[model samples]
Target: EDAELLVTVRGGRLRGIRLKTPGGPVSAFLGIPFAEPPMGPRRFLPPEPKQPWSGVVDATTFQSVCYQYVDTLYPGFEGTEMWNPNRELSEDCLYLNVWTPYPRPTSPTPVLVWIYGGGFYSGASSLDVYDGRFLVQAERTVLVSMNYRVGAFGFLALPGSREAPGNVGLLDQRLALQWVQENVAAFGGDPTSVTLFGESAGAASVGMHLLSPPSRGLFHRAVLQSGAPNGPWATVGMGEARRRATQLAHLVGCPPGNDTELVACLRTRPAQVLVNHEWHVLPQESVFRFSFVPVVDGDFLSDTPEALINAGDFHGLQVLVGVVKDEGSYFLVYGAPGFSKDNESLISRAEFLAGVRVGVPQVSDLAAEAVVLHYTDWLHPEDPARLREALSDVVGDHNVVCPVAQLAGRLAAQGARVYAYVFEHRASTLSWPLWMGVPHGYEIEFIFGIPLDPSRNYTAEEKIFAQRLMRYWANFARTGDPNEPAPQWPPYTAGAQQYVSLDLRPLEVRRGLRAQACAFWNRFLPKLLSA
Candidate 1:
């Protein structure tokens, strides 16, 4: 009897499915269009609202995901839904899904919108792991996850006209938020109270929106799981965005020169041409070496996020930021061919130092060598397990941990109600060898009730930890503070440098987690930029 559900918005009636879970029954509205298809003339430009449908819209099935070159470097990741989407791929994929508890509240419920992360390259809402039905069951809040264009289709920026001024992918996210504001109330979600949360590139997207003028009133709170806009992978200037567009245009045999002509020529090519055309046309000198990402378009973003945040250009709202205990594990999992190898092919100390040279381009040879010596002995840097651990800490701090902490500190100093945390839960199962600590995104399983690898046999502790994590997150979304029920969560205080440590015991708070490593990266940032 509870299987059938109906909801109406500006579009039309949506036939959603009701999912029963331990917590309660959740109504799921999947694949609802929030924008006009980004095809034909709308390909690269910012999205516009979708025209209201004439009849009852069939919103039961998951639609195609945003056009993206489906791939990943992590071996043995083929089984997961994130890397392997269940939906067809298309530019018409700017759609969102909603999950709400069946027993509608008298007033609108708190809303949590998830932006799936795949380095801004690969990810989709269609992944079973992103299914908000389960999360809504547990959190008892309205949950939304939407698909946006990614990769060159999403990040490619040109200066010809407003037609395709870049950040279209980010623009896609904005449009989704707008849809939430205008339409979420119908689904029992409060537009006035919204929290934007994501991991990695998704987290970075949350930060970018926080800085974007167009996104001023979109979200009231933000939860940045493992990324920030100032992080190395987050943004590129107009110079790089322009160059990458031209580079992609040329590769697909599109005519060169003049932004207008190149875009037209690109439009003439097939969808796969741009989706699959893979090459780093622009020199990736940034420490993280992300080939394509959001741009600092003078419109959406007036300047670098660091400049904006420092200048206090963003909205006044509560922010919750955090990183995993061993975020670097993600990089090291597949860093070398033989991470678990005890053989000669193991990464060497000299090789690791050389990587540091490239990663921190501003560091002088003296600084790089000194950095190499400051951590881990050079005796056998190549030892597989040790190498993974060493690089995990280095890369994690370099990208995720340090930047997030630094941002949290700065925000807190400015009196911007901020809370920071570290996910200390180490996974019993790992895509990368267990030799690597909790690797990047290890906490995603806990943050998202859906498992990254559903096949793995989860322990009771992890299950309890995930529930504990959701409680904290839901508490924060409901109120500014994450102190839920018995758990005592403390806000991050400036200078004190405090952060909560999330593990089997989620309520626990700790201080100066990896302070020594964070300090080094704090100093490394200035030099990485200009010194």
Candidate 2:
């Protein structure tokens, strides 16, 4: 075997390492930088292009994780398991890794760029599950994953921060794609045939990119798992973000008087201190909360993502969107105990304080009640805490379903190809399987083909589900549609409501389930517009 060294990339260098796999000879290139280090003045600003390097850089090792809070709200993170015990988090992290079957000019394979998710607060491109070896070996497509700034470092918006604005993290993504467009040919990837995919906050970031003018034309397709664009918290306007930043400034000992001085003071502070101050700024939700998110800045983001989709402002690319069954189930295990099931009780407490029923504006009681019934299935009485988990689903659905359904309808009306799905593969390793059902982030392992952690015992049925999920995901990456020779996943349309239900038994496409809930939320969109 010859150690054929390839050309170096801007951020770092990678050698053309050849290895014999079960399939065939494969070429792997890893840890290439797309942008310069996002530090100092570039901390919260858009990415700066990486300078070209002279020699072939050794990219065998993964780059440092992006700057983020030490603890994360999402499960299955790198530090959560002891395999990759190195928790070396840093701010100079704008690097991306690539895996190609063959880095030949003739091999112009389609590209798949993965954006990892950790509630927009934590995540790294080099996570174990994100390793693209399987995708390259199995699908033979070019796989790229990159680290971006997270938490206050990536998303903090302060007064006068408009010079840089928020969404630096998103800009980092766009730059990575741009780098791919310019250089992926060297790695045997077709830049034009690129698909952007992510989960949780990463999915939300993809949705924001779809709505961003600067991100237009960067990718041809998108896949959003367990997140949607429409919700009160989905997207923030610049005005609101600025206000939040002002409060953050006060928290960090910097006054809101001068934007430049405030940002300088905030950035110069110790990272741990900044993290502590950030914890104070975020809302005290049991699961997670922070004001750091993409804002609807007039330049970067023109309008709400849902509004852009409805108004036909998106890139008009193919879209695959869905939520996992019981998407909010993990919040129960990680957060205040029983909070997921006791959402109603929590809401009642809030209502008592506010002295008003917190109903979606303009939605009839019948519609709202119907939504509650559909979300809460009282049939399962194994645990008294199931009620709280069900309530969490309703809340999660309110945030995901309506926006996704609206986008599906809008895309269908525009005659664009679209596929919707719901992952219902319940994990037996869950604390209370009978009550918890299929919790959130459960589908990630299967899609990525990562082995289950030894701590969690998966049934044979779960293994099958994981395999099928990987096929469906890879199929979508190879083509725009998830359906191959297996069961057909019909395109969603306004007239004919249809969505694919993915479970252990088989893949089934059927009419929409929570239509009334979707309708109720749709009715309240106008209220949000007014607000």
Candidate 3:
């Protein structure tokens, strides 16, 4: 019965587990190695492709997740904990998983490759929420998710050195894409129809690929959820990346004498110890800043994303991008310190001002004043509750929503086929305050077809909506368009910016998503900052 599930790829032969689905049987091949473990001298370097094994590898179970610390600060917040790795952690964690329709399609099917999001620090393909079984059962497209290095392990750049160059995590992703290109065809997937999709940091990764010369032709279409390459947390300069690397070395008792000494000392330290001291790299005020991230490596990234997008220095692929209505509520409650003691607590006016400054530290005194005034309601200036709402909106627009809108228009202007949407349907099972509607990562439950799981107790309406989302995503992967099976989703363009509003009624198409507020952020505020 299981012999038919055995398949061969570049590394070796592998046997996958068979799962029964409502639509049909599915074959899941988990924990397939894509690269050699980045251990010891290889710790901070780009991933090297895995060598062939002697015999069949058992891919019936998930391997370890990349080394990283648990979110002890957030304690038990569901929004944060939901994404933490459930499997054991290890340095040898460069693996990828695949889900394909059983008895295979007659022809090569479209491939959807998922890159998970954890602010580029903590994410895993083994996470339950990312399981691609149902998506394969429903959509008949091959689903692939890869485990890449996160935090310092994946992004510590040594500036001007080939040995310690940064963005190895992205290089890991690129290698995985290359693996997909060469091996996906054997799994009944079309390399030409590959669609790269991700949420948050993963989405930002997708945007990076769009701007990366090495990543061109890896995928024909892309989906970015709540992040872009130009987002504040997504990319950093080589200077900052080097600064943080040295700071981390100092924290680990490795004095910043020289690059050679620092890197050698860093190699001696354990992976867990390196990640434990990762937060010290950020200043106190910048609590939400990612410690280590993709930098402007002259090789992978020649220029900043904004500069590249403006100059049309990116691949013009079919793109679908979007964000949730309350993209910042999750951060306001869990990420930002002192904003809320509990879900029901409100932030003071002073805290709100601090948040705005922290979110956009470079805002001129004049621009800062304008930003405060733009988000504040004149009618209820003194209301603490209203201030909390204003702060959430400020963070969301600056960090997620506005940037996504700007990316859509910019990509559309460059003549890429772009589809945009804003997810508004809040889950009924959330323990969060009602005010925190449709916060970040909430859309994943629906996007992964979680409502269709027998173990999950979701409503009929939610199941219907989830099915629609899977259909739209699968259709986009199969073809360049996300229509027909779902309601018609209008294309986004610079002239007439249009996008679907995914709410209780998922078909509502809105002309402009946060047009006025985005103009303040993407247009007016940027010009003000330059001045």
Estimate TM-scores for all models: 0.91, 0.84, 0.96
Across 1-531, the per-residue lDDT of candidate 1 in tens digits comes to: 443477778877778877766556778888899989989877887888898887777787899977776655443463233466567888889889998887754478999999988888778987766667666888788999888888877877885466568788888899999999988998789999899999899999998888886797888999998898888668888877777788888888888647778888888877888876644464633335455688886777898887887888333678989887777644542333333322333466666655565555445676666556556756865565465456656777777887787778778877688888887777766545445556567777667665422355778677777777787788889898888556677778667777777777635677874677777777664675465
Using lDDT as the measure, name the better of candidate 1 and candidate 2. Answer: 1
Models ranked on TM-score: 3, 1, 2
C-alpha-based local distance difference test score of model 2 = 0.67
Please report, in order, the local distance difference test score of every candidate based on alpha carbons: 0.75, 0.67, 0.85
Please write out the lDDT profile of model 3 over residues 350-388, one tens digit for every residue.
777777777665546788799899998889876888887
Q: Taking the tens digit of each residue's C-alpha lDDT, what string does model 2 give over 1-531?
A: 343437545444566555444456556665666788877766677788988776666676677887666544334553244223234777777878888775343667888889887777778877766767655666778888888877777777753455447878878888887888888877768988888889877788787777776676788888888776655555666676777677777887776567787777776766656667665664444343446777776666677776677787433567888877776545444443433332333333222212111222224455445555554545752333445544555555565666677777787787677788888876555443455567667677677655333334677677567667767777887788877766688887777878888887777878873676676567653554455
Taking all chains together, the TM-score of candidate 2 against the true structure is 0.84
Best of the candidates, lDDT: 3
Q: State model 3's lDDT.
A: 0.85
List runs of model 3 lying over 4 Å from the truth.
74-77, 313-316, 335-338, 362-367, 485-487
Backbone clashes in each candidate structure, one number apiece?
4, 7, 0
After the best TM-score superposition of candidate 1, give how far the Cα of residue 63 lies from its true spot, in angstroms.
0.9
Candidate 2 wrong stretches, greater than 4 Å: 1-5, 8-13, 16-26, 72-86, 102-105, 159-164, 283-288, 313-316, 333-337, 340-386, 428-434, 451-464, 525-531
Task: For candidate 3, report its TM-score.
Answer: 0.96
**Where does candidate 1 have its weakest 10-residue lDDT segment?**
336-345
Specify the poorest-scoring 10-residue window by lDDT in model 3.
333-342
